[PDB]
Scaffold this active site. Structure first.
Site, PDB file in Angstrom:
ATOM      1  N   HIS A   1       6.726   4.454 -42.913  1.00  0.00           N
ATOM      2  CA  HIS A   1       6.479   4.967 -44.260  1.00  0.00           C
ATOM      3  C   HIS A   1       7.148   6.319 -44.528  1.00  0.00           C
ATOM      4  O   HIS A   1       7.053   6.823 -45.658  1.00  0.00           O
ATOM      5  CB  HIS A   1       4.983   4.922 -44.640  1.00  0.00           C
TER       6      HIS A   1
ATOM      7  N   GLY B   1       0.304  15.393 -43.200  1.00  0.00           N
ATOM      8  CA  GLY B   1       1.443  15.609 -42.333  1.00  0.00           C
ATOM      9  C   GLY B   1       1.199  15.373 -40.857  1.00  0.00           C
ATOM     10  O   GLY B   1       2.113  15.606 -40.054  1.00  0.00           O
TER      11      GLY B   1
ATOM     12  N   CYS C   1       0.808  12.459 -39.658  1.00  0.00           N
ATOM     13  CA  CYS C   1       1.314  11.131 -39.343  1.00  0.00           C
ATOM     14  C   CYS C   1       2.385  11.227 -38.262  1.00  0.00           C
ATOM     15  O   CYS C   1       3.220  12.140 -38.262  1.00  0.00           O
ATOM     16  CB  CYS C   1       1.910  10.464 -40.592  1.00  0.00           C
TER      17      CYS C   1
HETATM   18  C1  LIG Z   1       2.656   6.007 -48.108  1.00  0.00           C
HETATM   19  C2  LIG Z   1       1.275   5.746 -47.489  1.00  0.00           C
HETATM   20  C3  LIG Z   1       1.412   4.750 -46.335  1.00  0.00           C
HETATM   21  C4  LIG Z   1       0.346   5.145 -48.597  1.00  0.00           C
HETATM   22  C5  LIG Z   1       0.672   7.114 -46.971  1.00  0.00           C
HETATM   23  C6  LIG Z   1       0.566   8.192 -47.842  1.00  0.00           C
HETATM   24  C7  LIG Z   1       0.034   9.409 -47.388  1.00  0.00           C
HETATM   25  C8  LIG Z   1      -0.387   9.551 -46.063  1.00  0.00           C
HETATM   26  N1  LIG Z   1      -0.941  10.884 -45.635  1.00  0.00           N
HETATM   27  C9  LIG Z   1      -0.040  12.013 -45.188  1.00  0.00           C
HETATM   28  O1  LIG Z   1      -0.535  13.031 -44.902  1.00  0.00           O
HETATM   29  C10 LIG Z   1       1.494  11.904 -45.074  1.00  0.00           C
HETATM   30  C11 LIG Z   1       2.345  10.991 -45.713  1.00  0.00           C
HETATM   31  N2  LIG Z   1       3.573  11.287 -45.331  1.00  0.00           N
HETATM   32  C12 LIG Z   1       3.525  12.316 -44.525  1.00  0.00           C
HETATM   33  N3  LIG Z   1       2.254  12.700 -44.372  1.00  0.00           N
HETATM   34  C13 LIG Z   1      -2.377  11.174 -45.738  1.00  0.00           C
HETATM   35  C14 LIG Z   1      -3.128   9.913 -46.288  1.00  0.00           C
HETATM   36  O2  LIG Z   1      -3.232   8.950 -45.586  1.00  0.00           O
HETATM   37  N4  LIG Z   1      -3.710   9.881 -47.630  1.00  0.00           N
HETATM   38  C15 LIG Z   1      -4.410   8.650 -48.134  1.00  0.00           C
HETATM   39  C16 LIG Z   1      -4.761   8.811 -49.388  1.00  0.00           C
HETATM   40  C17 LIG Z   1      -3.486   8.320 -50.251  1.00  0.00           C
HETATM   41  C18 LIG Z   1      -2.704   7.344 -49.322  1.00  0.00           C
HETATM   42  C19 LIG Z   1      -3.357   7.347 -48.138  1.00  0.00           C
HETATM   43  C20 LIG Z   1      -3.103  11.569 -44.482  1.00  0.00           C
HETATM   44  C21 LIG Z   1      -4.024  12.622 -44.564  1.00  0.00           C
HETATM   45  C22 LIG Z   1      -4.713  12.978 -43.425  1.00  0.00           C
HETATM   46  C23 LIG Z   1      -4.480  12.278 -42.243  1.00  0.00           C
HETATM   47  N5  LIG Z   1      -3.610  11.275 -42.201  1.00  0.00           N
HETATM   48  C24 LIG Z   1      -2.934  10.912 -43.269  1.00  0.00           C
HETATM   49  C25 LIG Z   1      -0.278   8.475 -45.186  1.00  0.00           C
HETATM   50  C26 LIG Z   1       0.255   7.248 -45.645  1.00  0.00           C
END
Ligand SMILES: CC(C)(C)c1ccc(N(C(=O)c2c[nH]cn2)[C@@H](C(=O)NC2CCCC2)c2cccnc2)cc1
Ligand SMILES: CC(C)(C)c1ccc(N(C(=O)c2c[nH]cn2)[C@@H](C(=O)NC2CCCC2)c2cccnc2)cc1
Lengths: 306, 306
Positions: A41, A143, A145
């Protein structure tokens, strides 16, 4: 003496953490030999995480679409491919700090250490159990991930988890290092939620054995139980059924303490029915299920405090 | 989201751990530049840990009385001296993995990570609070002596603890890296015991702020308190008195959540008097005191989930 959630020393993994950027998205990757693994992703646009088509998004990228940074050094990407929910980026440099390693898929109830990382920089380490519902109770901010989970045996790092996303209840979901999700989750924004969880009975029993090894017997009783009679109670209290295979796993702990497994099950039955009456076990006011039999053997003395 | 006891990544410390042997006693040492630090009780005979005279025991040793092993490599000792309860062994090789480092003495209530080691080999990492009674609730087996505690700030390792011994209740005692014990303990076998402990009020308040940052307010109330009125309750429940200095420390967390410190104190008063009524805070059924204000800021988001 003592009993703590103990992580593995993280240095062998720290030397593998890098930062991967594609477009405006940055996250962590894992650099082993001449390959960098990261969540696919990373290629996903902000305005369309609802319905990404990863094949169609990835074909639009070149090698130079990806920026990989190991500390302050740029690693040039010379190839890329998708494997399940991971990207594998081939780089022009083999990581000189690559430890002896394997990729393993861990089963529910098993534990591992997580090295939480941000922008490719390690920030903290903690121990987690893979829940029966295929989530972990991590501590992750935006961030995180691409942070990984692992166990270490005789200087070989067995990588078992890469973090992908946070679910609505604040728990975390991810893949093995072949990119296959644990649980029924997908790498897009949907209504998905963790299923109902359950208590890991085998781990509770292991931890009661740890309490006896460390010198405490207050919760034992004069009763025994059959496996089926215990399982009737387990269902009432949302505990996993105990199986004969799980009884066999407890053999060594039972031998070290002289407490038959089904006798410990009778103790656990009484604790579920009557509570702990304001007392503690290994410093805890509740029954703990995030230590496996192996974790107890690893951490406790091999000699019981009789 | 999430909130866990999180240790610092241990790799910078792993590269400093060595094994020290004198006679039949082996334990861990810390190798920085051309010096190895270890507990002075490494020179103590089995048959007389009751009344060692360290000056008289040490004068009977030469440099070659000490064997220092870094992995499979022998480091030759070329000088030795005693500093308080530590030995400083000068070796013929400067540790090429020495990180940027400092030695600090930490205050009661402050936290640090412990790298548990055996025979110079790192085995696990976990986070600890220095209790008000100057002990830690570690997990240590025979031969863990010389394991160290530390914090990390911008790649500088601040070493603050070296493990020396286990007390009768199973908790642990040790020194700073100048060899001065934390608490009134001594490095010999005596009747010494940990004094009565107390709950670290400032840390409980910090953790209630963490709960609000992460989105939970169920335990707040419409009341306030004076500092003196709160302290009357704290005495009844074996909590440390709250001081104006501690109120000031909570300023940033109070600002991030919009909850005045004395209003949070009123919430804590109600939780002590009425209990938690079967509810949890940050997944816990009890009030947690092993996270400092700094730990909360380090781990939580800088944006409150309003
Ligand atoms: C694109 C998609 C696969 C939907 C995704 C979007 C955001 C994240 N997330 C990030 O932080 C990130 C993305 N790219 C770089 N970092 C955060 C997240 O899951 N938020 C959720 C609410 C909206 C979508 C999912 C997160 C926060 C804390 C711990 N783990 C992950 C991960 C995945
Ligand atoms: C010589 C003296 C200073 C009295 C001492 C003796 C044993 C230990 N201990 C060791 O394991 C050791 C000694 N030398 C190398 N290892 C253990 C210990 O404190 N036992 C107590 C009961 C008898 C004396 C104190 C221990 C166990 C677990 C964790 N931490 C320490 C430490 C100090």
């Amino acid at each position: 003496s003592g009993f703590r959630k103990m992580a593995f020393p993280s240095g062998k993994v720290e030397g593998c953490m890098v930062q991967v950027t594609c477009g405006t998205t940055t996250l962590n990757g894992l650099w082993l030999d001449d390959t960098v693994y990261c969540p696919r992703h990373v290629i996903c646009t902000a305005e369309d995480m609802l319905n990404p088509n990863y094949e169609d998004l990835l074909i639009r990228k070149s090698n130079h679409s990806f920026l990989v940074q190991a500390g302050n050094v740029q690693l040039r990407v010379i190839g890329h491919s998708m494997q399940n929910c991971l990207l594998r980026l081939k780089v022009d440099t083999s990581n000189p700090k690559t430890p002896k390693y394997k990729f393993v898929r861990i089963q529910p109830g098993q534990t591992f250490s997580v090295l939480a990382c941000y922008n490719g920089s390690p920030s903290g380490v903690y121990q987690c159990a893979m829940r029966p519902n295929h989530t972990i109770k991590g501590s992750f901010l935006n961030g995180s991930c691409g942070s990984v989970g692992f166990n270490i045996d005789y200087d070989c790092v067995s990588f078992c988890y890469m973090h992908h996303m946070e679910l609505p209840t604040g728990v975390h979901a991810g893949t093995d290092l072949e990119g296959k999700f644990y649980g029924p989750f997908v790498d897009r924004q949907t209504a998905q939620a963790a299923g109902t969880d359950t208590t890991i009975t085998l781990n509770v029993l292991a931890w009661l054995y740890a309490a006896v090894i460390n010198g405490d017997r207050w919760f034992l009783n004069r009763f025994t139980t059959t496996l089926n009679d215990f399982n009737l109670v387990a269902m009432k209290y949302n505990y996993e059924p105990l199986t004969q295979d799980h009884v066999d796993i407890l053999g060594p702990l039972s031998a070290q303490t002289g407490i038959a497994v089904l006798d410990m099950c009778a103790a656990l039955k009484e604790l579920l029915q009557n509570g702990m009456n304001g007392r503690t076990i290994l410093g805890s006011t509740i029954l703990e299920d995030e230590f496996t039999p192996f974790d107890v053997v690893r951490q406790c003395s091999g000699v019981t405090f009789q």
